[PDB]
Curated annotation (Swiss-Prot), chain A:
Subcellular localization: Secreted; Host cytoplasm
Name recorded for this polypeptide: E3 ubiquitin-protein ligase IpaH1.4
Protein function: E3 ubiquitin-protein ligase effector that inhibits host cell innate immunity during bacterial infection by catalyzing 'Lys-48'-linked polyubiquitination and subsequent degradation of host RNF31/HOIP and RBCK1/HOIL-1. Host RNF31/HOIP is the catalytic component of the LUBAC complex, which conjugates linear ('Met-1'-linked) polyubiquitin chains at the surface of bacteria invading the host cytosol to form the ubiquitin coat surrounding bacteria. The bacterial ubiquitin coat acts as an 'eat-me' signal for xenophagy and promotes NF-kappa-B activation.
Classification lineage: Bacteria, Pseudomonadati, Pseudomonadota, Gammaproteobacteria, Enterobacterales
Source organism of this protein record: Shigella flexneri
Residues of the full protein shown: 37 to 271 of 575
Domain remark text: The LRR (leucine-rich repeat) domain forms a slightly curved solenoid and may mediate interaction with target proteins.
LRR repeat positions: 33-54, 55-79, 81-94, 95-114, 115-134, 135-159, 161-173, 174-197
Length: 235, 1221
């Protein structure tokens, strides 16, 4: 609908390599802008770069592409599906945003996390550090990273995934935790709060170099007749 | 020379042969530095000297430019005229170079200088010929490389220029003609180009030559490091994983680009580059192989198996994802996405096969390539720069740490740490004065790995093993005379006396004591060689009782007992003996306090505790003279009655009969108990059959013919007596139907007068080519109108006289080193049948000696000092082959006999050869099964032996088997190096031991070339003597023109008939070589060769008193020997080469004939040199935490180094070596 937007998208389509399906993305951008559609779907189009995005979109579906960098994110955006890309960094995240799935990428550092972030999936990345988690965050996925430590968890957090990392110590887990994915790390001990989780919570700490005092304590607590904590898997 | 062409100088052959004997005279008339002068004076005072010296001016050069042409024609075989011209100019350059420093440079040149130049520069000229015959194109490009390569002739530079032409051709023709062919071409050039690059080949080279050598080394590095890529990766990645094939061709060229600017891989720059190309190709192809790039699954952190592409698109293996497959939750650790619990996970095989298959193959090719790069980095004489070694040893860890198998990747991890020796050995190949810091750093970061367990005695025994191997295969076995100084030098490191310096000290002391051990344990009777073995012994004397550490003597006792046996060590220390020096014990007083019984191990203890109880009961019955308890002990135990009888007979031998061995007749069994035990064999119903009862009664009263009043002098008839009595028991009480031939070989061995004894040489020309064909008048013709060369019969190549013999065919056991068999039997099983036949004939040579005298076909005088010294040789060979100690080898013989006995589940005469073959192959199926069970049954035997009451008090019986810390309160125990595991005795590695590992870890289908080399290695080291017996077999034919009456028949007279002693000395040195080769190979010729030799011919050894008709290679009579020997050597060589015309898989026929034969075309490999250290090097040791180091030979690498250093390709065809009078 917009003349400047259509001109920019036409130039972007005309400036694409043969491997990219820029005609389909161009037509879909025109359709989304004309109808003010809430969701823009450009996934599995072998796109390497993206032009200026429609400002009214709330969900961005750009997974399974060859994108290395992303343009400015619209301020009304809420959910991002940009997994399976070649992204090295991410732009500023909108405040209205809630959902990211940036797994299977080559990012090294994350920008500031929005206050309304709900679920985070940055697995299979090259992160060496994490930003401070938002208070409302419920799920974070940082599996297969190079993290040496993890920031303190919020009190509304329900799911944690940190397998295949280099974390040495775990902060105290909130009672809202119901599933902890913690295998393949350099952990020598577990915080006591892991014993205070709900009975139906799931925790696996296999592959961790837990000390003898730690496994003695865990064996004493978990095998007790009055134990009501979560089920912990060591293998 | 072709038709109508003549010699360049008249009578060119006589001049050359005249000069080549004046040179021989000058050899012994003076020393090495006197030759260049004396040869010239000798040829200058000769009449030909003035005949030529009168000629002056440029005519001189004329003659010379002719002579050194014809010389080449009379010494080499120039394929074309261009090669002849190139060799001419090369030899002219060499001659001028020699004349440059001659006290008369460029005044007048003379004929002897050509001979001097060729003799000094023979290796370079022949290597040049090899280069120009591997690929002729090199000469073509070299043809214009005289204007292109301005050739100023003052030194031999032509070979290096040819090397550059060839290597530029290689660089400009990479992968071009079906890269397999390029691979074979570079591998064929490997030897000549490396020799050119080798420093000890171009000693006298000049500045230009040194520069061109530098340049050719620079190109050869990249050509050869790339070369191995082309071998492991391209050639092979994709025979199997195809999609990658063309893909790999993309990166190979890139590899050269990475090495194009610089190719010095043993440097920071170039090495950090190869590593990079390789990593990149790996990643790129992994990506291609799959849509998203393949990576191992999260929880398993191993690989991927039976997976499925979930909505998470993460192939996660089933039984590892069982945490979610059993708790019934539906997320994967990577994505955590969850569709509701209703979906059923499964297996996607098409993806699964690809992932699993790619992983195994990708990991193998890359590892091979990396290994081959570290071994072109660790090559010449100095370790790579500090950064290179730091990056190498730092690559062993993942930061599951330190589970990396020396790979530049980061994806494969095995398990909890497995410390390997791949990096330590290639780093220790140099001297222990420049790699000390590297190894100490390696072990210091090794102990900080993951809190290595405190029980660190199986890690130090890995570093000590690797240090000992390097010391023993780096300078301990390379020398020929320097040992005379080494034996003194180690003596020095006995006058002045855990980190790596201390570990090296410990290993060197262990090897010093190891050599002192087999200097201390050699058969007495030849007492000589005083200086070395007594100065060294006194040095060890002062070292041991000067250090005050009582562990070295413990190691000495352990090595002595593992070399000769327990009894030798026990008898080595008895107060007051003259042969006794009580050195290695510090325990003489304690053993002398318990001197009533020195100690005898019941080696029959491999039966269970049942025989252990029966022997105790029998001993009690005998000493109390009340034997009725035996009659209930037999009832107390419970086995099949045959085993009952065998155990009882062995008990009488061990407790009753053996007492008739002590010279102290007072200790002999008094008749009081003998009467009772004889009576109770009488009332024994278990010994119901007559023969067993008679044998038992004979054993009790010492009336068994084997245990006669006079046995052998020492305890050689002691262990053999034990084995023979066990064989007696097994044959008497055994019920198996295939034991009958061994029974009849004993027990009246007169029926077995016309039977083929098992494991005897067979007529190889009976079961099944290029071999010689027979003319109607019995003459072996050449390879196969055409007529016979001799007697001119109307036949030509273009009956059933089976030479097999019955009885004991082989002769003097004193000449016997390696076992060679047929009929597809393992050497271990083959020996243990040749040891059970000698154990069924020695007992047979006790009832009637004359009957066996008619069986041993090379007749002897006493078939009881013959067969016992034969069984001693059998045991010595078995010890080397299995690697166990002497006592354990007697034990394995006993265990094999037990397996024959405890077996309760085709002829009884062995009348026909095929029937003997069938009996062999049917007893091999019973001997073999619990012969591979020697890793668990032997420890059980050792426990039962060093657990019994008889010896579990002797000090020496605890040093050998138990732990000396328990009973000796004088061993220094402060450090880890003082534990009784480091000072234990390992098994020495020999060529014969490897012949057992190769055929155990199946090697008739996995390493065919190594198997065909090892199983014929005994007589293959004699092939290198072919260029010597093809020289005196052609120097005689020339000398012996047709005289048709060679009357004289004594080589000694011929050797004395020559004047000018030096010449007869040379003929003596050659005839000795021929005689040594014939005497050391004659026995195999008569039953293995193809030229039918009269059976008397290969019967007795030859020396300098036989007929002169031997040497002449005539086709009939005495000359058939000197033809059969050469034919057999040629057959061995071409058989090995044909075995190489395998896996290389491409036909290649150099096909040198037996008149051009030189040192290059024969497999020339002395055993202590290249063969022994190479096998020691590839022995790699892996230690797993909580587990002892495991010896692991790498058979593929050994085979590759064998074929790429001796067996590349050099085939042969027999068409001469004949009296062309």
């Amino acid at each position: 609908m917009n003349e400047f937007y259509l001109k920019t998208w036409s130039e972007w389509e005309k400036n694409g390599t043969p491997g990219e399906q820029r005609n389909i993305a161009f037509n879909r951008l025109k359709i989304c802008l004309q109808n003010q559609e809430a969701e823009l779907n450009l996934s599995e189009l072998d796109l390497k770069t993206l032009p200026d995005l429609p400002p009214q979109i709330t969900t961005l579906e750009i997974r399974k592409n060859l994108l290395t960098h992303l343009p400015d994110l619209p301020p009304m955006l809420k959910v991002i599906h940009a997994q399976f890309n070649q992204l090295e960094s991410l732009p500023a995240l909108p405040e209205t945003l809630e959902e990211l799935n940036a797994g299977d990428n080559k990012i090294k550092e994350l920008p500031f996390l929005p206050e309304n972030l709900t679920h985070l999936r940055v697995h299979n990345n090259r992160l060496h550090i994490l930003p401070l988690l938002p208070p409302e965050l419920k799920l974070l996925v940082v599996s297969g990273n190079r993290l040496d430590s993890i920031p303190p968890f919020p009190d509304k957090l329900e799911g944690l995934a940190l397998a295949n990392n280099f974390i040495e110590q775990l902060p105290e887990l909130p009672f809202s935790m119901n599933r902890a994915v913690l295998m393949n790390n350099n952990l020598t001990t577990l915080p006591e709060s892991v014993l205070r989780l709900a009975q139906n919570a799931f925790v696996n700490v296999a592959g961790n170099p837990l000390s003898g005092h730690t496994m003695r304590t865990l064996q004493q607590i978990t095998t007790g007749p009055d134990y009501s904590g979560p089920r912990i898997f060591f293998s | 020379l072709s038709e109508n062409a003549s010699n360049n100088v008249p009578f060119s052959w006589k001049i050359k042969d005249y000069l080549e004997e004046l040179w021989v005279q000058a050899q012994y008339i003076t020393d090495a530095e006197g030759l260049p002068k004396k040869f010239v004076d000798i040829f200058q005072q000769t009449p030909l000297g003035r005949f030529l010296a009168q000629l002056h001016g440029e005519p001189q050069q004329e003659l010379l430019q002719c002579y050194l042409k014809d010389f080449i024609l009379l010494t080499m075989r120039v394929s074309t005229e261009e090669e002849l011209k190139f060799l001419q100019m090369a030899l002219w350059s060499c001659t001028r170079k020699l004349k440059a420093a001659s006290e008369a440079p460029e005044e007048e040149v003379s004929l002897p200088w050509v001979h001097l130049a060729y003799q000094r520069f023979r290796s370079r000229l022949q290597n040049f010929s090899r280069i120009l015959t591997i690929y002729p194109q090199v000469l073509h490009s070299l043809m214009e490389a005289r204007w292109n390569h301005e050739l100023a002739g003052c030194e031999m530079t032509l070979d290096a220029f040819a090397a550059m032409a060839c290597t530029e051709m290689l660089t400009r023709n990479t992968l071009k003609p079906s890269p397999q062919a390029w691979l074979q071409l570079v591998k064929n050039l490997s030897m000549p180009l490396e020799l050119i690059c080798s420093d000890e080949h171009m000693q006298g080279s000049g500045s230009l030559a040194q520069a061109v050598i530098r340049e050719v080394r620079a190109q050869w590095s990249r050509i050869f490091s790339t070369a191995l890529f082309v071998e492991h990766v391209l050639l092979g990645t994709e025979s199997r994983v195809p999609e990658l094939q063309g893909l790999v061709t993309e990166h190979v060229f890139l590899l050269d680009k990475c090495l194009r600017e610089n190719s010095d891989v043993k440097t920071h720059g170039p090495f950090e580059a190869v590593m990079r190309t390789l990593c990149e190709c790996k990643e790129t192809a992994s990506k291609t192989l799959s849509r998203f790039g393949i990576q191992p699954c999260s929880i398993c952190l191993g690989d991927a198996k039976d997976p499925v592409c979930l909505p998470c698109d993460h192939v996660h293996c089933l039984r590892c994802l069982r945490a979610w497959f059993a708790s019934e939750q539906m997320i994967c650790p990577y994505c955590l996405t969850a569709l509701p619990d209703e979906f059923s996970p499964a297996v996607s095989q098409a993806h699964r096969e690809a992932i699993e298959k790619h992983a195994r193959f990708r990991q193998m090719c890359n590892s091979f390539f990396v290994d081959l790069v570290s071994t072109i980095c660790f090559k010449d004489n100095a370790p790579p720069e500090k950064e290179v070694i730091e990056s190498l040893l730092s690559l062993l860890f993942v930061q599951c740490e330190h589970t990396k198998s020396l790979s530049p990747f980061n994806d494969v991890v095995d398990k909890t740490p497995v410390i390997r020796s791949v990096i330590l050995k290639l780093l220790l190949k140099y001297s222990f004065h420049d790699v000390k810091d590297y190894i100490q750093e390696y072990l210091t970061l090794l102990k900080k790995k993951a809190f290595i367990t405190e029980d660190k005695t199986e890690l130090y025994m890995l570093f000590i093993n690797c240090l000992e191997d390097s010391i023993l295969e780096k300078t301990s076995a390379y020398s020929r005379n320097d040992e005379l100084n080494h034996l003194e030098e180690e003596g020095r490191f006995l006058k002045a006396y855990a980190s790596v310096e201390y570990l090296q000290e410990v290993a060197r002391i262990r090897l010093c004591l190891d050599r002192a051990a087999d200097f201390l344990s050699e058969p007495e009777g030849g007492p000589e060689m005083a200086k070395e073995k007594q100065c060294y012994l006194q040095q060890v004397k002062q070292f041991c009782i000067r250090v005050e550490n009582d562990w070295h003597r413990v190691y000495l006792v352990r090595k002595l007992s593992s070399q000769r046996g327990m009894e030798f060590v026990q008898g080595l220390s008895k107060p007051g003996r003259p042969h006794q020096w009580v050195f290695p014990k510090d325990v003489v007083k304690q053993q002398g306090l318990r001197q009533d019984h020195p100690g005898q191990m019941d080696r029959y203890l491999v039966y269970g505790d049942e025989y252990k109880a029966l022997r105790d009961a029998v001993a009690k019955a005998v000493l109390e003279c009340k034997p009725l308890g035996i009659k209930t002990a037999l009832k107390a135990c419970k086995t099949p009655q045959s085993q009952q009888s065998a155990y009882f007979l062995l008990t009488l031998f061990r407790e009753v009969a053996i007492l008739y061995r002590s010279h102290n007749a007072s200790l002999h069994p008094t008749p009081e108990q003998c009467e009772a035990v004889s009576k109770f064999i009488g009332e024994c119903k278990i010994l119901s059959p007559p023969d067993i009862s008679r044998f038992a009664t004979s054993l009790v009263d010492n009336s068994v013919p084997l245990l006669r009043a006079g046995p052998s002098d020492s305890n050689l008839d002691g262990t053999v007596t034990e084995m023979a009595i066990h064989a007696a028991a097994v044959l008497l009480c055994g019920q198996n139907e295939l034991l009958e031939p061994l029974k009849n070989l004993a027990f009246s061995p007169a029926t077995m007068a016309h039977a083929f004894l098992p494991t005897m040489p067979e007529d190889l020309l009976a079961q099944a080519r290029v071999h010689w064909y027979t003319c109607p008048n019995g003459h072996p013709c050449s390879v196969g109108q055409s007529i016979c060369i001799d007697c001119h019969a109307p036949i030509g190549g273009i009956d059933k006289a089976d030479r097999t013999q019955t009885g004991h065919v082989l002769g003097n056991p004193q000449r016997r080193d390696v076992v060679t068999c047929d009929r597809g039997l393992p050497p271990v099983v083959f020996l243990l049948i040749r040891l059970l036949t000698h154990l069924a004939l020695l007992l047979g040579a006790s009832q009637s000696s004359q009957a066996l005298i008619n069986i041993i076909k090379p007749p002897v005088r006493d078939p009881k000092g013959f067969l016992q010294q034969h069984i001693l040789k059998d045991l010595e060979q078995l010890a080397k082959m299995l690697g166990h100690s002497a006592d354990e080898t007697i034990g394995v013989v006993h265990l094999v006999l037990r397996r024959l006995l405890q077996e309760q589940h085709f002829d009884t005469e062995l009348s026909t050869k095929e029937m003997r073959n069938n009996w062999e192959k049917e007893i091999a199926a019973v001997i073999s099964p619990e012969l591979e069970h020697l890793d668990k049954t032997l420890p059980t035997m050792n426990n039962l032996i060093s657990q019994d009451k008889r010896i579990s008090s002797n000090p020496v019986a605890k040093i050998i088997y138990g732990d000396p810390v328990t009973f000796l309160p004088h061993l220094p125990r402060k450090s880890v190096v003082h534990c009784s595991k480091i000072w234990s005795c390992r098994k020495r590695i020999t060529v014969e031991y490897l012949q057992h590992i190769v055929e155990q870890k199946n090697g008739k289908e996995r390493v065919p070339i190594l198997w065909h080399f090892l199983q014929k290695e005994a007589e293959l080291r004699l092939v290198k003597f072919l260029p010597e017996i093809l020289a005196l077999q052609r120097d005689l034919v020339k000398q012996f023109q047709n005289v048709q009456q060679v009357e004289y028949s004594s080589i000694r007279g011929f050797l004395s008939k020559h004047s000018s002693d030096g010449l007869r000395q040379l003929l003596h040195n050659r005839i000795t070589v021929f005689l040594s080769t014939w005497n050391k190979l004659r026995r195999s010729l008569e039953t293995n060769g193809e030229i039918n030799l009269p059976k008397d011919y290969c019967s007795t050894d030859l020396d300098l008193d036989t007929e002169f008709e031997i040497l002449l290679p005539r086709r009939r009579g005495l000359g058939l020997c000197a033809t059969a020997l050469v034919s057999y050597l040629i057959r061995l060589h071409n058989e090995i080469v044909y075995a190489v015309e395998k896996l290389s898989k491409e036909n290649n026929s150099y096909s040198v004939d037996a008149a051009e034969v030189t040192e290059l075309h024969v497999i020339s490999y002395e055993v202590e040199r290249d063969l022994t250290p190479l096998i020691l090097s590839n022995c790699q040791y892996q230690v797993e935490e909580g587990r002892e180091t495991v010896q692991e030979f790498d058979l593929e690498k050994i085979q590759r180094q064998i074929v790429s250093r001796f067996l590349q390709g050099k085939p042969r065809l027999s068409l001469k070596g004949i009296p062309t009078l």
